[PDB]
Ligand binder design. Structure first.
Ligand SMILES: [Mg+2]
Ligand SMILES: [Mg+2]
Ligand SMILES: [Mg+2]
Ligand SMILES: [Mg+2]
Ligand SMILES: [Mg+2]
Ligand SMILES: [Mg+2]
Ligand SMILES: [Mg+2]
Ligand SMILES: [Mg+2]
Ligand SMILES: [Mg+2]
Ligand SMILES: [Mg+2]
Ligand SMILES: [Mg+2]
Ligand SMILES: [Mg+2]
Ligand SMILES: [Mg+2]
Ligand SMILES: [Mg+2]
Ligand SMILES: [Mg+2]
Ligand SMILES: [Mg+2]
Ligand SMILES: [Mg+2]
Ligand SMILES: [Mg+2]
Ligand SMILES: [Mg+2]
Ligand SMILES: [Mg+2]
Ligand SMILES: [Mg+2]
Ligand SMILES: [Mg+2]
Ligand SMILES: [Mg+2]
Ligand SMILES: [Mg+2]
Ligand SMILES: [Mg+2]
Ligand SMILES: [Mg+2]
Ligand SMILES: [Mg+2]
Ligand SMILES: [Mg+2]
Ligand SMILES: [Mg+2]
Ligand SMILES: [Mg+2]
Ligand SMILES: [Mg+2]
Ligand SMILES: [Mg+2]
Ligand SMILES: [Mg+2]
Ligand SMILES: [Mg+2]
Ligand SMILES: [Mg+2]
Ligand SMILES: [Mg+2]
Ligand SMILES: [Mg+2]
Ligand SMILES: [Mg+2]
Ligand SMILES: [Mg+2]
Ligand SMILES: [Mg+2]
Ligand SMILES: [Mg+2]
Ligand SMILES: [Mg+2]
Ligand SMILES: [Mg+2]
Ligand SMILES: [Mg+2]
Ligand SMILES: [Mg+2]
Ligand SMILES: [Mg+2]
Ligand SMILES: [Mg+2]
Ligand SMILES: [Mg+2]
Ligand SMILES: [Mg+2]
Ligand SMILES: [Mg+2]
Ligand SMILES: [Mg+2]
Ligand SMILES: [Mg+2]
Ligand SMILES: [Mg+2]
Ligand SMILES: [Mg+2]
Ligand SMILES: [Mg+2]
Ligand SMILES: [Mg+2]
Ligand SMILES: [Mg+2]
Ligand SMILES: [Mg+2]
Ligand SMILES: [Mg+2]
Ligand SMILES: [Mg+2]
Ligand SMILES: [Mg+2]
Ligand SMILES: [Mg+2]
Ligand SMILES: [Mg+2]
Ligand SMILES: [Mg+2]
Ligand SMILES: [Mg+2]
Ligand SMILES: [Mg+2]
Ligand SMILES: [Mg+2]
Ligand SMILES: [Mg+2]
Ligand SMILES: [Mg+2]
Ligand SMILES: [Mg+2]
Ligand SMILES: [Mg+2]
Ligand SMILES: [Mg+2]
Ligand SMILES: [Mg+2]
Ligand SMILES: [Mg+2]
Ligand SMILES: [Mg+2]
Ligand SMILES: [Mg+2]
Ligand SMILES: [Mg+2]
Ligand SMILES: [Mg+2]
Ligand SMILES: [Mg+2]
Ligand SMILES: [Mg+2]
Ligand SMILES: [Mg+2]
Ligand SMILES: [Mg+2]
Ligand SMILES: [Mg+2]
Ligand SMILES: [Mg+2]
Ligand SMILES: [Mg+2]
Ligand SMILES: [Mg+2]
Ligand SMILES: [Mg+2]
Ligand SMILES: [Mg+2]
Ligand SMILES: [Mg+2]
Ligand SMILES: [Mg+2]
Ligand SMILES: [Mg+2]
Ligand SMILES: [Mg+2]
Ligand SMILES: [Mg+2]
Ligand SMILES: [Mg+2]
Ligand SMILES: [Mg+2]
Ligand SMILES: [Mg+2]
Ligand SMILES: [Mg+2]
Ligand SMILES: [Mg+2]
Ligand SMILES: [Mg+2]
Ligand SMILES: [Mg+2]
Ligand SMILES: [Mg+2]
Ligand SMILES: [Mg+2]
Ligand SMILES: [Mg+2]
Ligand SMILES: [Mg+2]
Ligand SMILES: [Mg+2]
Ligand SMILES: [Mg+2]
Ligand SMILES: [Mg+2]
Ligand SMILES: [Mg+2]
Ligand SMILES: [Mg+2]
Ligand SMILES: [Mg+2]
Ligand SMILES: [Mg+2]
Ligand SMILES: [Mg+2]
Ligand SMILES: [Mg+2]
Ligand SMILES: [Mg+2]
Ligand SMILES: [Mg+2]
Ligand SMILES: [Mg+2]
Ligand SMILES: [Mg+2]
Ligand SMILES: [Mg+2]
Ligand SMILES: [Mg+2]
Ligand SMILES: [Mg+2]
Ligand SMILES: [Mg+2]
Ligand SMILES: [Mg+2]
Ligand SMILES: [Mg+2]
Ligand SMILES: [Mg+2]
Ligand SMILES: [Mg+2]
Ligand SMILES: [Mg+2]
Ligand SMILES: [Mg+2]
Ligand SMILES: [Mg+2]
Ligand SMILES: [Mg+2]
Ligand SMILES: [Mg+2]
Ligand SMILES: [Mg+2]
Ligand SMILES: [Mg+2]
Ligand SMILES: [Mg+2]
Ligand SMILES: [Mg+2]
Ligand SMILES: [Mg+2]
Ligand SMILES: [Mg+2]
Ligand SMILES: [Mg+2]
Ligand SMILES: [Mg+2]
Ligand SMILES: [Mg+2]
Ligand SMILES: [Mg+2]
Ligand SMILES: [Mg+2]
Ligand SMILES: [Mg+2]
Ligand SMILES: [Mg+2]
Ligand SMILES: [Mg+2]
Ligand SMILES: [Mg+2]
Ligand SMILES: [Mg+2]
Ligand SMILES: [Mg+2]
Ligand SMILES: [Mg+2]
Ligand SMILES: [Mg+2]
Ligand SMILES: [Mg+2]
Ligand SMILES: [Mg+2]
Ligand SMILES: [Mg+2]
Ligand SMILES: [Mg+2]
Ligand SMILES: [Mg+2]
Ligand SMILES: [Mg+2]
Ligand SMILES: [Mg+2]
Ligand SMILES: [Mg+2]
Ligand SMILES: [Mg+2]
Ligand SMILES: [Mg+2]
Ligand SMILES: [Mg+2]
Ligand SMILES: [Mg+2]
Ligand SMILES: [Mg+2]
Ligand SMILES: [Mg+2]
Lengths: 211, 120, 122, 114, 55
RNA sequence: UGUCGGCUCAUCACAUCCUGGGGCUGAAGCCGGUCCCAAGGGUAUGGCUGUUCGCCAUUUAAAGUGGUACGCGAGCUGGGUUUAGAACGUCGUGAGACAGUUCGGUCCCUAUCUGCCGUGGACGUUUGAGAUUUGAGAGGGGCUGCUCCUAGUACGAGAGGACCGGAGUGGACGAACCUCUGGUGUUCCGGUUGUCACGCCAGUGGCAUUGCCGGGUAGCUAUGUUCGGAAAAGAUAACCGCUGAAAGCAUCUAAGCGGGAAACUUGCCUCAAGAUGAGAUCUCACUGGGAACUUGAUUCCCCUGAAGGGCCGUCGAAGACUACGACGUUGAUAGGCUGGGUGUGUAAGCGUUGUGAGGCGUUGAGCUAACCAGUACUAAUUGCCCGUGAGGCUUGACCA
RNA sequence: CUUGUCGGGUAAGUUCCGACCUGCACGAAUGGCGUAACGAUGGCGGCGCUGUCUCCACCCGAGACUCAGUGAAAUUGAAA
RNA sequence: AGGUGGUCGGGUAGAGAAUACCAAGGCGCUUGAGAGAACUCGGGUGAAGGAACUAGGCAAAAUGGCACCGUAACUUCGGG
RNA sequence: AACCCACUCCCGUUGAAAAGGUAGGGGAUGACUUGUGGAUCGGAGUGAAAGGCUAAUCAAGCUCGGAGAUAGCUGGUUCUC
RNA sequence: AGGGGAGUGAAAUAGAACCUGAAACCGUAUGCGUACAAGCAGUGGGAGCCUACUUGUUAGGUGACUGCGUACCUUUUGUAU
């Protein structure tokens, strides 16, 4: 953790090794990141760095945000993110590329997962359905019982019910870096990355490490 | 879920849908200005514009393909003789949609569908 | 994938003509047995003068499936039927010959006897 | 998908002669049996062919020892060392899945002389 | 399933606090001076200074 | 106040079945027996029977015991019990009866309130606004087999066979994803039966479950792919101690100092300032006049409405309606058009061969959804409404 | 009593089939014992077939959802 | 979306007054428009397995025409 | 097949319907189905027998009278000190 | 259709659904209270605000905050039940 880059999910592919094994790969474009603000102990408490990436039109950036992007001459971009760093040193106006990663180098990737609208209990919670025959009355995929009699006499908080298999944010831990294309700004990561093509993903060094 | 899916059901079977949009396209080539519903007008321009493009190259095989998709002798002759020659140099966008209010009976949003360069 | 009640024929000369799976070994609530996994079978048809009899509970190894096996490059191999080899008490083949091809995933340290006898290893 | 195609291009560096379903091809497959490596021939009729660039694939079917077997090769993997067409088949389809219900003289495929 | 006690005057009026109506976005045809709906053709037949329906 | 069993969904206790830590042993080792601590996670599939139970077959690390209206029919079932029909055995002269059998036999309800799962509208946070955040607190997760090395070493006459410590590979469970392997793909391409129509031939279209079929793009998906459970720290349980008197000895305790488990608090993931205790940081906007007083956190009028937000439109792997996200001519937001890709499989017309069905050439041809790239041809107007005029008082510290 | 005992079938059979006789409490026109054909009749077992199931996935229509019009019902001591 | 006696009843396939597409003739069934969630109703397809489901193969899937060959126990001699 | 009937599943149960509908199902030259007209009825009729049917009513129809039957049983019983 | 004026009438809020015209129930306007607060909705204490005028030992509307406080009938040995 403590430092990373923001990229876009470009889609999955494969690469073959000379030994003949094919590695599933997720290609991540990392347009170079620009430091916007450095946060220290005497001004904010915690230590962190604020980063922007991409590019935005001049008619979509407000006067409040334009003056923030102008205190450090950075030029506005899509979104603003903040990485909580333990002990490093940055100055407003720097560049952060894929060049803090190497091959090997387990990382964690965060993204907004694909959104299912309003899911039932079978899809959302892996419930199992009642009978499709043998007398069942209009109660095939319905959840069933949700409590007990007079004792409790109210459903318990946290009950598993239906609705919104979400587009939340999820992290996938311990993903290996396969190739770091420095000149074309690419990160090739072994495995699946949350979200759809085009979404913004955060890449950080693996927190758990070890195996 | 309907991620990245195209088309509109419009509460009809696929046989009803296919037949409704031939009549609506055949009417448009004849009167050059029709009044219909906005969801139906947006789904029509995926049907009648590929016909005007096909009419640009006149041949026996092209006029046989046109008749199969719009089973109307007059409409096939309306294309290949007036349209396709009118829009020979226009790269797409042969028809125009303009919102025009709501129906009285059911409050359905309406629209005007018309060929772009009517000589009037 | 092979589960209980599945019928799969024999790739030996052990007498058994057709067997049926009655258990998949190696874990609780285990569902499927692929190529190279141990199962528990019962004999459903046998040769008149074979060395196994009908209705006999014993252990077999899965050697050939319709579902198939995957390879590292991403390829796949599939057969036209599920086949098994009957093993004795000490996890060893009972018949002496083996029919049809076998696969390299069975070329392990405990089933090398049934790979050296197969007319073809894929 | 504009830069995915660029990553895939730098791995498409093989001959891969043209062939179509119904042909009888021979595929030389790399096999490791310890430290030494050899080539194992797989001969059969092609019944399916997937055209996707790097992710291309094809399926051949052969009767090995009285038991049928089908293998789906990846066209651009290093495992598929080479391929040669031994016979050209004359078929009216693109996927010959009906051949799995025919066994002997009923599974013959005509020849394409030109 | 049906109520056990009848609802009060205040209890049903609170439910209707979200039942108010919004007003349409209108605009004035600059060339003529005719009020029409925003992005729609005028009830006369003018859109963006162009006669389109000839009544 | 609907009574057995099954199904779906659970929640708690600990008198612990497995995994975890220990004392004693009639504990050599491998396996055991018994007691103490421990509730984090796990904890079979079938044959018979209406069965709970039970007995069997084969597994598993183990197939725990109980409370919850013997949990759960305004969540499902209806095999059993317990209506009306009929029959057997037995009892009664008879109508009939039988915790004795047997075959058949209608299971209603659109959710007001509390509760729960998702998702919004209003206002407040003391001038307003754009954006990024800290973390009081809450939830999720925690399972485990086998093989190899140490090592055929310790132990043992032998047979047999480890503790501690490493490496690999699986079962079950969970999440994300669609590169691969497949499924689907009534919006794509073909084959074909019956009939009707387009004047007729050819060529096509309607109807017949998409007429029946063979394939199949994008999207969705598992049976496909990748990942996860940790390590570590603290304070402890049973237990094991060091020093040590009361009580010249002894003694883990009375003062003092340690080791110690899947339990507890962090560590990993998510939500989180309506945390009314409403937090913090960067930047931006607004610098007019009069009057009436019930003479200041007052009211009324005229002028002036900024930063920004909304309405509206083109939409979206976002979505029940919302909300969220992108764009609106200074523009690739959607459709079309132009190239390509993909799928299907050699179109129509014409020319040859044949008496004809048919074959052959032009020809991998014709067509091609949702995909990739480009391009203003078509649609996103040239608008309206909210939101103001420098942000109260007291105390104290630094200034002037 | 009772899932009596033995044999068959099944990896495993309280049901089924063949026997034994200890008939709680069969028995000869409220008929006894058999029987070809027949039965939307009761019990048991096979082949084929399959979404019945492991374990559900995708797709097509009608509701449910939103908008415009018409417009009920059971229930109700009062409800912060 | 119930019930109601009798008569006529064409073409192409077809044994047919069944069934499919049509003629003569008649009609689109007196609320619509969208969108494309859970769930419910009526259907299509499904990898590997094939009754492991269940009180019970309930439901579904499967068979299905004409000509010819061929066909068991048992039997009341017809049959099956 | 028409016609008569009603064995199974599902839907519907505030129904389209106070007993239906879609899929399958039985008989279909006969102890058959059906139109019109007629006969038998309330301790009575009719019944290939289910205590079944006799106008959505049957272990004794409906209607009006005896009749305001009887109710040792529930319920209710009204202004003030 | 229904209204706004004008006219008749002692009186059209006596207008033909026509004397008077209550209650349930439904609205518009003003004044006060109400978005950190848990329960038979009252009662005892009580600030502030608004109105009127006898200008505050007054009258009327509202009731922040706070102490106590589980409806009525019936039937019962006994009911918030
Ligand atoms: Mg979505
Ligand atoms: Mg289930
Ligand atoms: Mg049942
Ligand atoms: Mg029902
Ligand atoms: Mg159903
Ligand atoms: Mg209940
Ligand atoms: Mg309670
Ligand atoms: Mg739960
Ligand atoms: Mg789209
Ligand atoms: Mg059709
Ligand atoms: Mg209520
Ligand atoms: Mg009540
Ligand atoms: Mg009110
Ligand atoms: Mg409302
Ligand atoms: Mg369950
Ligand atoms: Mg749970
Ligand atoms: Mg408790
Ligand atoms: Mg204990
Ligand atoms: Mg235990
Ligand atoms: Mg233990
Ligand atoms: Mg122990
Ligand atoms: Mg012990
Ligand atoms: Mg526990
Ligand atoms: Mg516990
Ligand atoms: Mg537990
Ligand atoms: Mg627990
Ligand atoms: Mg605990
Ligand atoms: Mg813990
Ligand atoms: Mg079981
Ligand atoms: Mg069991
Ligand atoms: Mg049973
Ligand atoms: Mg208790
Ligand atoms: Mg109890
Ligand atoms: Mg209990
Ligand atoms: Mg119970
Ligand atoms: Mg219980
Ligand atoms: Mg039920
Ligand atoms: Mg029950
Ligand atoms: Mg009920
Ligand atoms: Mg209930
Ligand atoms: Mg229900
Ligand atoms: Mg029953
Ligand atoms: Mg039943
Ligand atoms: Mg009876
Ligand atoms: Mg007697
Ligand atoms: Mg009695
Ligand atoms: Mg019974
Ligand atoms: Mg019956
Ligand atoms: Mg029910
Ligand atoms: Mg309540
Ligand atoms: Mg916290
Ligand atoms: Mg809180
Ligand atoms: Mg927890
Ligand atoms: Mg926690
Ligand atoms: Mg030894
Ligand atoms: Mg020794
Ligand atoms: Mg999984
Ligand atoms: Mg895929
Ligand atoms: Mg794809
Ligand atoms: Mg595939
Ligand atoms: Mg495929
Ligand atoms: Mg398919
Ligand atoms: Mg298909
Ligand atoms: Mg696909
Ligand atoms: Mg004609
Ligand atoms: Mg013709
Ligand atoms: Mg046709
Ligand atoms: Mg027609
Ligand atoms: Mg089809
Ligand atoms: Mg068919
Ligand atoms: Mg496919
Ligand atoms: Mg999934
Ligand atoms: Mg620890
Ligand atoms: Mg001492
Ligand atoms: Mg001591
Ligand atoms: Mg101490
Ligand atoms: Mg410690
Ligand atoms: Mg563990
Ligand atoms: Mg706040
Ligand atoms: Mg704040
Ligand atoms: Mg704005
Ligand atoms: Mg502005
Ligand atoms: Mg905004
Ligand atoms: Mg939208
Ligand atoms: Mg440009
Ligand atoms: Mg192609
Ligand atoms: Mg064609
Ligand atoms: Mg041609
Ligand atoms: Mg040719
Ligand atoms: Mg050629
Ligand atoms: Mg082509
Ligand atoms: Mg018995
Ligand atoms: Mg027996
Ligand atoms: Mg046996
Ligand atoms: Mg059985
Ligand atoms: Mg006698
Ligand atoms: Mg008798
Ligand atoms: Mg007798
Ligand atoms: Mg007799
Ligand atoms: Mg007698
Ligand atoms: Mg008799
Ligand atoms: Mg007899
Ligand atoms: Mg009969
Ligand atoms: Mg019988
Ligand atoms: Mg059985
Ligand atoms: Mg549909
Ligand atoms: Mg409405
Ligand atoms: Mg006819
Ligand atoms: Mg007919
Ligand atoms: Mg006609
Ligand atoms: Mg209607
Ligand atoms: Mg509708
Ligand atoms: Mg369905
Ligand atoms: Mg089907
Ligand atoms: Mg298929
Ligand atoms: Mg299947
Ligand atoms: Mg299959
Ligand atoms: Mg089979
Ligand atoms: Mg069973
Ligand atoms: Mg079972
Ligand atoms: Mg059936
Ligand atoms: Mg059928
Ligand atoms: Mg009739
Ligand atoms: Mg009858
Ligand atoms: Mg019946
Ligand atoms: Mg059915
Ligand atoms: Mg019939
Ligand atoms: Mg029927
Ligand atoms: Mg018969
Ligand atoms: Mg018949
Ligand atoms: Mg007659
Ligand atoms: Mg009479
Ligand atoms: Mg009678
Ligand atoms: Mg009656
Ligand atoms: Mg009588
Ligand atoms: Mg009487
Ligand atoms: Mg009457
Ligand atoms: Mg009457
Ligand atoms: Mg009386
Ligand atoms: Mg009297
Ligand atoms: Mg009373
Ligand atoms: Mg008056
Ligand atoms: Mg009057
Ligand atoms: Mg009146
Ligand atoms: Mg009056
Ligand atoms: Mg008078
Ligand atoms: Mg009144
Ligand atoms: Mg008011
Ligand atoms: Mg508080
Ligand atoms: Mg308050
Ligand atoms: Mg409250
Ligand atoms: Mg309280
Ligand atoms: Mg309360
Ligand atoms: Mg007072
Ligand atoms: Mg006062
Ligand atoms: Mg008070
Ligand atoms: Mg009070
Ligand atoms: Mg109190
Ligand atoms: Mg009472
Ligand atoms: Mg009582
Ligand atoms: Mg009592
Ligand atoms: Mg009391
Ligand atoms: Mg009460």
């Amino acid at each position: 953790m403590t430092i990373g880059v923001v990229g876009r999910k470009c889609g999955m592919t494969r690469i073959f090794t000379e030994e003949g094994v094919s590695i599933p790969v997720t290609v991540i474009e990392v347009e170079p990141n620009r430091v916007t603000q450095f946060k220290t102990e005497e001004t904010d408490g915690y230590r962190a760095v604020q980063v922007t990436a991409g590019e935005r039109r001049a008619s979509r950036v407000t006067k409040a945000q334009a003056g923030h992007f102008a205190k450090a001459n950075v030029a506005a971009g899509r979104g603003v993110w903040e990485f909580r760093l333990g002990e490093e040193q940055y100055a407003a106006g720097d560049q952060i590329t894929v060049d803090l990663f190497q091959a090997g180098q387990m990382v964690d990737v965060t993204g907004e997962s694909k959104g299912k609208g309003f899911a039932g209990t079978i899809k959302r919670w892996n419930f199992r359905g009642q009978d499709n025959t043998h007398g069942n009355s209009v109660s095939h995929r319905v959840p069933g019982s949700i409590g007990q009699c007079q004792t409790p006499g109210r459903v318990f908080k946290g009950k598993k019910m239906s609705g919104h298999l979400g587009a939340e944010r999820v992290t996938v831990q311990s993903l290996e870096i396969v190739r770091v294309d420095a000149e074309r700004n690419l990160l090739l990561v072994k495995g699946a990355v949350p979200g759809a093509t085009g979404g913004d993903v955060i890449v950080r060094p693996a927190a758990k490490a070890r195996g | 879920m309907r991620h990245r899916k195209s088309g509109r059901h419009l509460s009809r079977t696929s046989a009803h849908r296919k037949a409704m949009f031939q009549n609506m396209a055949v009417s448009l080539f004849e009167h050059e200005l029709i009044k219909t519903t906005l969801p139906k007008a947006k789904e029509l321009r995926r049907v009648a514009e590929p016909l005007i493009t096909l009419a640009k190259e006149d041949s026996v095989a092209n006029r046989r393909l046109a008749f199969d998709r719009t089973r109307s002798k007059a409409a096939v002759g309306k294309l290949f003789n007036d349209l396709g020659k009118r829009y020979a140099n226009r790269p797409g966008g042969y028809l125009r949609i303009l919102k025009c209010g709501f129906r009285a009976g059911d409050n359905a949003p309406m629209a005007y569908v018309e060929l772009v360069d009517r000589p009037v | 994938m092979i589960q209980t009640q599945s019928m799969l024929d024999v790739a030996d000369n052990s007498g058994a003509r057709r067997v049926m799976c009655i258990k998949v070994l190696g874990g609780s609530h285990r569902r499927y047995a692929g190529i190279g996994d141990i199962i528990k079978v019962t004999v459903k048809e046998a040769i008149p003068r074979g060395k196994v009899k009908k209705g006999q509970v014993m252990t077999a190894v899965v050697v050939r499936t319709k579902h198939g096996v995957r390879r590292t490059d991403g390829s796949i191999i599939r057969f036209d039927g599920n086949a098994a080899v009957l093993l004795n008490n000490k996890q060893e083949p009972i018949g002496t010959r083996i029919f049809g091809p076998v696969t390299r995933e069975l070329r392990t340290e405990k089933f090398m006897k049934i790979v050296s006898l197969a007319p073809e290893v894929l | 998908n504009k830069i995915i195609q660029q990553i895939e291009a730098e791995q498409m560096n093989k001959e891969i002669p043209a062939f179509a379903p119904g042909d009888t091809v021979i595929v030389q497959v790399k096999v490791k049996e310890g430290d030494r490596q050899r080539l194992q021939a797989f001969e059969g009729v092609v019944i399916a062919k997937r055209n996707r660039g790097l992710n291309s694939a094809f399926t051949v079917r052969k009767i090995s020892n009285g038991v049928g077997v089908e293998r789906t090769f990846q066209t651009y993997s290093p495992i598929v060392d080479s391929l040669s067409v031994k016979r050209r088949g004359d078929v009216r389809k693109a996927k010959l899945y009906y051949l799995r219900a025919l066994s002997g003289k009923a599974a013959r495929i005509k020849e394409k002389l030109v | 399933a049906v109520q056990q006690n009848k609802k009060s005057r205040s209890a049903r009026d609170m439910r209707r606090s979200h039942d108010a109506l919004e007003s349409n976005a209108l605009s004035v045809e600059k060339s003529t001076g005719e009020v029409h709906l925003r992005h729609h053709v005028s009830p006369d037949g003018f859109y963006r200074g162009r006669k389109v329906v000839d009544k």
